[PDB]
Amino acid sequence: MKYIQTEQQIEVPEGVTVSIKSRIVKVVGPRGTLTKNLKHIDVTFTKVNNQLIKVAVHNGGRKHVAALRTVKSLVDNMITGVTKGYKYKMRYVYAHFPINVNIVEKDGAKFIEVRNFLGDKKIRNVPVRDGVTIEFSTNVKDEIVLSGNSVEDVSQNAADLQQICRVRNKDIRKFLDGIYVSHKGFITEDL
RNA sequence: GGCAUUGCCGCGAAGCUACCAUCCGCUGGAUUAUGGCUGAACGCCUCUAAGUCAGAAUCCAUGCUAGAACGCGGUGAUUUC
Ligand SMILES: [Mg+2]
Ligand SMILES: [Mg+2]
Ligand SMILES: [Mg+2]
Ligand SMILES: [Mg+2]
Ligand SMILES: [Mg+2]
Ligand SMILES: [Mg+2]
């Protein structure tokens, strides 16, 4: 159809400043600064009233206007990550063998060490992405929490931890052992 | 000592040689399938569309062989008569 114009809104809260050069977005908030390169999408940003950014596609097809809403969501996620932050809670699940998850250093790189997964003798090392903070939650049994400004990095670190613990050569409907994302929310409560 | 078309027999150094002997046979990236992240399309959902992660005896490199006899570089000496 090639819709003449399609646009989405990006509400900017008070403590957030959004600097958008050609398609390099820099969002700054209480928690830090996030940056994204969107030169692959061909959209047009415009600041309306310092609390609203409009992102528009002109003469755009179906896929183009779908990716317009994707761009809106990505900038929203940046703003949410610099205001509220992101936290993914993972639970260790095991029937017999206790999964031993720890934080270790190797050349100063902050790996998450997983030992004894399904009785294995192999040690699974998952690097911690920069900006992602790993805390083990006392008052909840076998809970690891990954927090950070960028949902991309926190969710990908959680997914890496989940995929390092995939069961091979077994019926995974029975052998349910693993480290699974149980909660995905924000750092600041009730925001 | 000769000859017996190496006369025959035992041992036999060297050389050649045998999974019949011994030694040696490298580690990075990108990927496929697949499993994922974020995420619209389609207020939800979604590994997919934009973007993105891991990943095969695969691929391309590292490494190994040849060195273009019309590919190239550095360097030495260049004829007293
Ligand atoms: Mg079986
Ligand atoms: Mg005679
Ligand atoms: Mg004789
Ligand atoms: Mg998801
Ligand atoms: Mg794609
Ligand atoms: Mg030659």
Side-chain angles (χ1 to χ4, degrees):
Chain A
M1 165 142 152
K2 258 52 160 179
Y3 320 93
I4 292 170
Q5 202 253 6
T6 313
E7 76 217 337
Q8 305 279 333
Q9 318 256 46
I10 300 163
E11 171 190 275
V12 182
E14 281 286 82
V16 166
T17 79
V18 186
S19 281
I20 305 186
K21 199 57 148 164
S22 40
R23 268 147 295 155
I24 294 134
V25 187
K26 193 180 78 215
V27 179
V28 180
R31 306 196 27 91
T33 294
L34 292 186
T35 207
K36 187 172 280 316
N37 187 300
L38 297 164
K39 288 180 89 41
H40 57 86
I41 189 43
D42 273 88
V43 295
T44 303
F45 291 99
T46 164
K47 168 208 197 177
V48 172
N49 55 63
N50 197 31
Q51 276 88 29
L52 180 80
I53 307 304
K54 279 199 204 300
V55 58
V57 159
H58 308 288
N59 194 34
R62 184 172 166 83
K63 307 277 210 198
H64 204 181
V65 307
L68 169 69
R69 229 281 186 183
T70 301
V71 160
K72 180 228 170 180
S73 266
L74 290 190
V75 181
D76 289 359
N77 283 3
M78 283 164 84
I79 293 166
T80 286
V82 304
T83 25
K84 313 187 212 199
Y86 279 98
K87 86 153 54 163
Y88 277 35
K89 285 161 165 169
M90 305 203 92
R91 306 290 310 272
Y92 325 150
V93 171
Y94 51 83
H96 178 91
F97 286 107
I99 303 163
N100 294 312
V101 183
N102 279 268
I103 283 295
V104 313
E105 328 292 323
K106 292 173 164 65
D107 323 279
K110 201 156 269 288
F111 292 90
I112 301 170
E113 207 193 43
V114 178
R115 303 162 154 268
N116 206 48
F117 174 71
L118 257 182
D120 282 25
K121 284 301 199 271
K122 193 220 192 300
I123 298 162
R124 287 151 216 252
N125 278 288
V126 185
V128 167
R129 313 192 108 83
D130 291 324
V132 187
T133 282
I134 316 280
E135 313 292 14
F136 302 93
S137 94
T138 61
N139 89 328
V140 180
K141 189 43 191 204
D142 294 322
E143 220 197 38
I144 183 166
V145 175
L146 305 90
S147 285
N149 297 341
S150 75
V151 63
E152 259 90 353
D153 303 324
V154 309
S155 65
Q156 188 58 70
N157 222 151
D160 285 7
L161 185 50
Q162 177 151 349
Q163 298 258 287
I164 209 85
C165 291
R166 280 180 293 169
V167 178
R168 291 306 173 218
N169 305 313
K170 291 294 172 322
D171 194 341
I172 67 176
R173 304 164 318 167
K174 171 62 150 181
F175 294 80
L176 294 165
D177 286 37
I179 308 184
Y180 306 97
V181 179
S182 50
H183 186 273
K184 24 180 67 156
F186 314 130
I187 298 170
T188 70
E189 182 56 34
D190 74 78
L191 247 75

